[PDB]
Amino acid sequence: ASATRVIQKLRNWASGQDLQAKLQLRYQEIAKRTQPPPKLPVGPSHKLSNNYYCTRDGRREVVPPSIIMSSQKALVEKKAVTPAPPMKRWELSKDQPYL
Amino acid sequence: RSRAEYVVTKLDDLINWARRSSLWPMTFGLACCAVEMMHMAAPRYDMDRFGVVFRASPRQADVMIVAGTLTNKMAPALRKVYDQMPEPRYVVSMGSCANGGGYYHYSYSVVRGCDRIVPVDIYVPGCPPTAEALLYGILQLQRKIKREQKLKIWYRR
Amino acid sequence: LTLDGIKDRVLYVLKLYDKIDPEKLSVNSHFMKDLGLDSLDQVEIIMAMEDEFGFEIPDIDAEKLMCPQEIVDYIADKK
Amino acid sequence: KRPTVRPRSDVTHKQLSAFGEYVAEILPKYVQQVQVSCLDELEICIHPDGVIPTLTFLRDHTNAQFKSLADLTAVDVPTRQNRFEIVYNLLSLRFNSRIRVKTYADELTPIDSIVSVHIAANWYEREVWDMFGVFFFNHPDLRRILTDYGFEGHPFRKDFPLTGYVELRYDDEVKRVVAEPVELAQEFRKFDLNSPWEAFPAYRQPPE
Amino acid sequence: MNLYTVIFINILLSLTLILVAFWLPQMNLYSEKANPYECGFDPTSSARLPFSMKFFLVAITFLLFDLEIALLLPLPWAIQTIKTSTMMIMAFILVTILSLGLAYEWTQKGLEWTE
Amino acid sequence: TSVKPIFSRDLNEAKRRVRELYRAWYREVPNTVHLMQLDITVKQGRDKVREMFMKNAHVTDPRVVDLLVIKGKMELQETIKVWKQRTHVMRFFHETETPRPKDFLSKFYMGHDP
Amino acid sequence: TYKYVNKKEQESEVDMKSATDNAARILMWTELIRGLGMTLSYLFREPATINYPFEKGPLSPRFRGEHALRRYPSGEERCIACKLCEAICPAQAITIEAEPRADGSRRTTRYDIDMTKCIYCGFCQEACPVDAIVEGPNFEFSTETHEELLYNKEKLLNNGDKWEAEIAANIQADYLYR
Ligand SMILES: COC1=C(OC)C(=O)C(C/C=C(\C)CC/C=C(\C)CC/C=C(\C)CC/C=C(/C)CC/C=C(/C)CC/C=C(\C)CC/C=C(\C)CC/C=C(\C)CC/C=C(/C)CCC=C(C)C)=C(C)C1=O
Ligand code: SF4
Ligand code: SF4
Ligand code: SF4
């Protein structure tokens, strides 16, 4: 940022870009190293009522996997299916489709 | 003391100055610590400004910066490239892995510190040590080999 | 087929084998029940025959080659 | 609704259940179990003889198109007769789906390699052999891939110790890097980090 | 005499430099120090084995082209001749023949490397 | 008591594969000693190969013998193509490792290990 | 959505001006010249090199450096030998032995941190319930022997006494976030 105007014009012409608007060296635009103290918010479970843990126990809602068929438990015109509907084709970008 | 002792001390100072102003590490690294090593090579810290320039072959290397986890499969290769370096050579262990195994100390395939394989001159702690810390270790090594008194010990023999 | 030549060069290599007493060695002496060797010693002997004769002997003949007489008539009917 | 619990969609569970029924009725010769987890993941547990037909069908069927093998691994559970559970995670880009195929093995029954189905299975099965000792039939070049040369034992097994049996050091008398029986300056302190109270009543096994 | 003197001075200087480089520092050489370098592992085979050359035809062409250069080099004295038409025609013929040979080899893929 | 074979139906062709592997090791030992600069002689290398085979000589299960042959062929390939180094080859000899004596008095004097 | 990085749309046909432009680009090395110009601009820029050790790279109060054991303002050790740091240490780099003191206080008789084993992750300082063990911001503590990085309780207490003027300020600046 201490470069003379001659050197700035030389650098801008040599690079083809306006380098002074976007300098890679931080001078003063950065945040101050000392900051005011924060006050972080509390989560949604920080309440004094209607907050029983059994109603929000996501860890204990895990069940053992459901057996679709078994060689011992089941002891065993419909259409063919797929694991999912086929993936929709991606649309070309309307912002910049080609470089 | 004797006049020749002063001349020998000054020659020792000259040799140590040359060897500490020209420290060429081998282009050798193993892990995240070697990533921090090339961040020391990066323009912020400029090991080249300090006179420290990587050379690929161990024959042109002066110091070996063991930067990463030395495994059992890697240990013969590390010993080989250390042995192929010429005699005024130094070793800078970098990071907890190269120091004492680190996070993989109790592993079946990890050498518990590269000092079991090569004689380490300087240990740089961290996981990873910052490029500041590695540069500090390099400067500490420069001071250590400034402290060497080879011709003075030879004269006192 | 130069039977005497092949048999005395077989006996020469068998003498060159260090685990066999040349005094106890004979043409009809078995490797296992007479010379007291192992199957590994026998296959080393067969490999010595291979590398002294210049032709390969398969493994299926190795368990049949039990005496020097078996070796010499085997290489006779092979050559 | 609840901010701390993962949202659950039933459509993926229904689709995976339907596809599991589909694969199970297509291949009854090899499929032993089909399950869908509560995390919406489909697992098909097959006989080891049907690894090649099952993987080939999943890769080349029009309704499957699982053309990408995500990974191949093994799990050592040393309390069953066939201790190594071989797991194939597969990705279908056509249907944007993932499937898991399981089979079993022990130390002395090799299973067929699927290098002829997926080429990534080459290095994946090399890793499985190196880490567990599960041999693979018809592999182009099966050997160790991660352990040291001449390493004895398969270290990802449960009974293999964490530190191993040997350690390397530079011996100056022989001027080499040599292997010694392992001695630790500080032993690895194992911890008993298991609460004596049951955490999940849904997984309570019945008493013996 | 002066050129011979300065060549000998260069020879003496470089011999002195390599001599002081070999006799000044402390020697400590052992087997692993002087074993050949193969990026940390032992060499699988000797480096004196045959090592295939994919530009051998280009090297032979380089021999012929270097002799074409040797033919073309007396031109700065050839341009001083009285009969400049003959010299100009002969030089044009030589360079055109050289260019036609290069074009024929380029067409016949001789400049491309094998395998 | 009826199991699926790996390669060998019984012990005979398993021993045939063992003999083939021993033959390959016996042929490869001099080339290894010449190629890797080994201090040992050719006699010592073949003695070590025989010692390893005799160490494994007590097994009678065809599947275990087949897997031992497969492992031996893997190590043989690691020696043929120079992937094992001088250190890896010399690790079979344990020349830097002192051996624990097998007698009760020496084990009593050394420590508590039986 | 997606985009093409190298696919060209339609064709530009052939023109004498375009052919001459491509000919000049091939013959006169135009992209090579502008690469030279870019390097020239970088030459005439200002380097980003600080003058170490007289200038140091910026850090934050959260920085995890050399370990230290702190005290209360009375001078009593903060550590109460609870072994939470030892339990949570992912590298098992902490060794703790303890007994009641002469006044009955629950204090350590051994607090060792193997800094060659430590991974500098801060789990000890975030598991400590009394802010005893911390990672103070020292990072220039490289040694010449492996032993000097095997810290014991005396070394850690000396580090806490040395760096208390900075560690307390960092904890003051940081503790509302944690
Ligand atoms: C993520 O994955 C990974 C990687 O992947 C990306 C890795 O890569 C990887 C490995 C990582 C590493 C090994 C880290 C290595 C770091 C880097 C690759 C980045 C560093 C960058 C470079 C090396 C590029 C450097 C470029 C430069 C331009 C620097 C210049 C360097 C040079 C070699 C050229 C300059 C030459 C020298 C320094 C020596 C020159 C001087 C001399 C030889 C002196 C000669 C002079 C004389 C003899 C003259 C004498 C005569 C006289 C008359 C003098 C008079 C004397 C008197 C006394 C009077 C790992 C582990 C990894 O995980
Ligand atoms: S000490 Fe940490 S950062 Fe360095 S190599 Fe080991 S794991 Fe990576
Ligand atoms: S920073 Fe992490 S690895 Fe280091 S002592 Fe603390 S808990 Fe252990
Ligand atoms: S967590 Fe804190 S109080 Fe507990 S033992 Fe560790 S340093 Fe002491």
Resolution value (Å, 1 decimal): 2.9
**Which residues on adjacent β-strands are paired with residue A5?**
none
Assess contact for F14 and F62: CB atoms under 8 A: yes
How far is the C-alpha of D104 from the C-alpha of D78, rounded, in Å? Answer: 12
Polymer length of chain C: 79
On whether G121 is known to bind a ligand per the annotation, the reply is: yes
**Count of C-beta atoms within a 10 Å radius of residue F75:** 21
Residue F36's nearest CA partner among F84, F94, F96, F92 is F84
F5 interfaces chain D, CB cutoff of 8 Å: no
Ligand 1, residue B38: give the atom nearest the CA. Answer: 16
C-alpha–C-alpha distance, residues D190 and E4, integer Å: 81
Tell me which of C4, C8, C34, C38 is the catalytic residue: C38
The percent of chain F in helix, strand and coil, each rounded to the nearest 5, is: 60, 0, 40
Q: Do chains C and E touch (3 or more CB pairs under 8 A)?
A: no
CATH architecture observed for domain E2-115 = Up-down Bundle (1.20)
Check if G37 contacts A (Cβ < 8 Å). yes
Which residues of chain G lie closer than 8 angstroms to A14, CB-CB?
37-38, 40-41, 44
Contact status, residue B74 vs residue F85, Cβ threshold 8 Å: no
Strand pairing class (D42-46; G94-100) = unpaired
Closest Cα partner for B133 from B78, B65, B58?
Answer: B65
Q: How far F88 CA lies from chain B's nearest CA (Å)?
A: 9
How far away, in angstroms, is B130 Cα from ligand 2 center?
11
- The residue range of the domain holding C53 is 1-79
C38 is catalytic: yes
> Which residues does B119 contact at the CB level (< 8 Å), separation at least 6?
B91
Q: How far is CA G54 from CA B45, E59, F27, G49, G140, in A?
A: 12, 58, 66, 12, 13
- Give the separation between CA D143 and CA D154, rounded to whole angstroms: 12
**How many CB atoms are located within 10 Å of the residue G50 CB?**
16
Q: What are the Cα distances from residue C10, in Å, to C14, C15, C57, C70? A: 6, 9, 14, 11
Chain B positions touching G60 (Cβ under 8 A) are none
Shortest alpha-carbon distance between residue A39 and chain D (Å): 22
Classified as helix, coil or strand, E66 is helix
Beta strands in B34-130 (DSSP E): 63-67, 90-94, 122-124
**Can chain A be said to touch chain G, i.e. do they have 3 or more Cβ pairs within 8 angstroms?**
yes
Give the alpha-carbon dihedral of F10, F14, F19, F24, to 10 degrees.
160
Q: Looking at the CA of G65, which ligand is closest?
A: 3
**What 3-state class would DSSP assign to E74?**
coil
- Interface check for B79 against chain D (CB to CB < 8 A): the answer is yes
Report the separation in Å between the CA atom of D188 and the middle of ligand 4, taken as the mean of its atom positions: 20
Q: Are F48 and F92 in contact (CB under 8 A)?
A: yes
Following DSSP, what letter does each residue of B71-97 receive, concatenated?
Answer: BTTTHHHHHHHHHTS-SS-EEEEEHHH
Q: How many CB atoms lie within 10 A of CB B134?
A: 28
Residue D45: phi and psi, rounded to 5, are -100, 120
Three-class SS of F10-21? CHHHHHHHHHHH
Sorted by sequence, the CB contacts under 8 Å of residue F92 that are 6+ apart come out as: D150, F48, F52
Tell me how far CA of residue D187 lies from CA of A51, D129, F112, G148, in angstroms: 46, 29, 18, 20
Three-class SS state of G4: strand
Q: Which residues of E touch F86 (CB under 8 A)?
A: 42
Number of other residues whose CB lies within 10 A of the CB of residue G134: 28
Sign of the torsion formed by the C-alpha atoms of D140, D145, D150 and D151: negative
Kindly give the interhelix angle for D10-26 and D51-60, rounded to the nearest 10 degrees: 120
Return the closest-CA partner of residue B32 out of B74, B69, B71. Answer: B69
CB pairs under 8 A between A and D: 90
CB D55 within 8 A of CB D67: no
Residues A67, A73: Cα–Cα separation, whole Å: 9
Mutate which of G62, G85, G111, G123 for ligand 3? The one with the most ligand atoms within 8 Å of its CB, which is G123
Secondary structure in 3-state letters for chain A: CCCCHHHHHHHHHHHCCCCCCCCCCCCCCCCCCCCCCCCCCCCCCCCCCCCCHHHCCCHHHCCCCEEEEECCCCCCCCCCCCCCCCCCCCCECCCCCEC
Question: What are the φ/ψ torsions at residue D145 (nearest 5 degrees)?
Answer: -130, -25
Element (H, E) at G117: none
**Mutation target vs D (from G83, G88, G92, G112; most D CBs, 10 A cutoff):** G92
Task: Give the pair of three-digit tokens for residue F7.
Answer: 């390669």
Contact indicator for B23, B64 with CB cutoff of 8 Å: no
**Of E4, G10, F6, which Cα lies nearest the Cα of D109?**
F6
The answer to whether the beta carbons of residues D97 and D61 sit under 8 Å apart is: no
Contacts for A86-89: CB closer than 8 Å, 24+ residues apart:
A86/D94, A86/D95, A87/D93, A87/D94, A87/D95, A87/D96
Residue with CA closest to ligand 1 atom 37: B53
In chain D, residues with a C-beta closer than 8 Å to the C-beta of B106 are 162-163, 184, 188
- DSSP-derived secondary structure for chain D: --TTS----HHHHHHHHHHHHHHHHH-TTTEEEEEE-TTS-EEEEE-GGGHHHHHHHHHH-TTT---EEEEEEEEE-TTSSS-EEEEEEEEETTTTEEEEEEEEE-TT--EE--TTT-STHHHHHHHHHHHH---EET-SS---SSSPTT--S-TTSSSS-SS-SEEEEEETTTTEEEEEE---SS---------SS-S-GGG-PPP-
Q: Which of A33, B15, A86, D107 is nearest to G61 (CA)?
A: A33
Please give the single-letter amino acid code of residue E102: L
User: Taking the mean position of all CA atoms in its chain, how far away is CA D102?
Assistant: 8
Closest CA relative to residue G75, chosen from G151, G135, G164: G164
Q: Where are the domains of chain E?
A: 2-115
Q: Within 13 A of D199's CA, how many CA atoms are on the CB side?
A: 7
Q: Please state, in angstroms and rounded to a whole number, the distance separating the CA atoms of residues F65 and F75.
A: 15
D188 touching chain G per CB within 8 A: yes
Show residues of chain C in contact with F69, CB under 8 Å: none
Residues G94, G115 contacting (CB under 8 angstroms): no
Q: Domains of chain B (ranges plus CATH)?
A: 3-157 (3.40.50.12280)
Among all bound ligands, the one having the nearest atom to the CA of B126 is: 2
CB D134 within 8 A of CB F64: no
- Domains in chain C, number: 1
What residue in B sits closest to F86 (Cα-Cα)?
A: B76
Contacts with F, B 18-47, CB within 8 Å: none
Find the CB nearest D188 among G92, G95, G114: G92
Taking the CA atoms of residue A83, residue A86, residue A87 and residue A90 in that order, the dihedral angle to the nearest 10 degrees is 170
From CA F32, how far away is CA F48, in angstroms rounded?
13
Give ligand 1 pocket residues (Cβ under 6 A): B 27-31, 34, 37-38, 41, 48, 53-54
**B–F CB contacts, 8 A cutoff, strictly below:** 3
B-chain residue closest to D148, CA distance: B73
Q: Do B136 and G143 touch (CB under 8 A)?
A: no
From the CA of G122, give the closest atom in ligand 3. 1
CB–CB of D180/D170 below 8 Å?
no
CA angle E4, E6, E8 (to 5 degrees): 70
Q: Which of G71, G72, G79 to mutate to test the pocket of ligand 4 (most atoms within 8 A of CB)?
A: G79
CB atoms within 10 A of CB B123: 31
Positions at the binding site of B: 32-33, 97, 127
Phi-psi group of D86: left, alpha or beta (phi > 0 → left; psi -120 to 50 → alpha; rest → beta):
beta
Retrieve residue G166's tokens: 């900075």
- Is E40 in contact with B80 (Cβ distance < 8 A)? yes
Task: Judge whether D162 and B108 are in contact, CB under 8 Å.
Answer: yes
DSSP 8-state secondary structure symbol assigned to residue E27: P
Within 13 A of F52's CA, how many CA atoms are on the CB side? 19
- Strand ranges inside F72-111, DSSP E: none
Joined together, the tokens standing for residue A46 give 């920080």
Q: What distance in Å separates residue B50's CA from the closest CA in chain G?
A: 9
- What tokens does G98 get? 């303890």
Which residues 6+ apart lie within 8 Å of D9 measured at CB? D40
Q: Cα(B113)–Cα(B100) distance, rounded to whole angstroms? A: 4
Question: What is the position in ligand 4's atom list of the atom closest to the CA of G96?
Answer: 5
Backbone angles phi, psi at C37, to 5 degrees: -95, 170
Of the candidates F42, F27, F48, the one whose C-alpha atom is nearest the C-alpha of residue F95 is F48
**DSSP per-residue letters across chain C:** --HHHHHHHHHHHHHHSTTS-TTT--SS--TTTTS---HHHHHHHHHHHHHHHTS---GGGTTT--SHHHHHHHHHHH-
How far is ligand 3, taken at its centre, from the CA of residue F60, in Å? 51
The DSSP 8-state label assigned to residue B23 in this structure reads: B
Contact B81, B64 (CB under 8 A): yes
How far apart (Å, rounded) are the C-alpha atoms in residues G96 and E35?
48
Q: What is the dihedral of CA G142, G145, G151, G152, to 10 degrees?
A: -150
Burial F2-37 (b: 16+ CB within 10 A, else e): eeeebbbeeeebbbbbbbbbbbbbbebbeebbebbe
Q: Which residues of D touch B117 (CB under 8 A)?
A: 168-170, 177
Q: What is the CA radius of gyration of chain C?
A: 11
Best interface-test mutation with E: which of F39, F82, F83, F87 has the largest number of E CBs within 10 A? F82
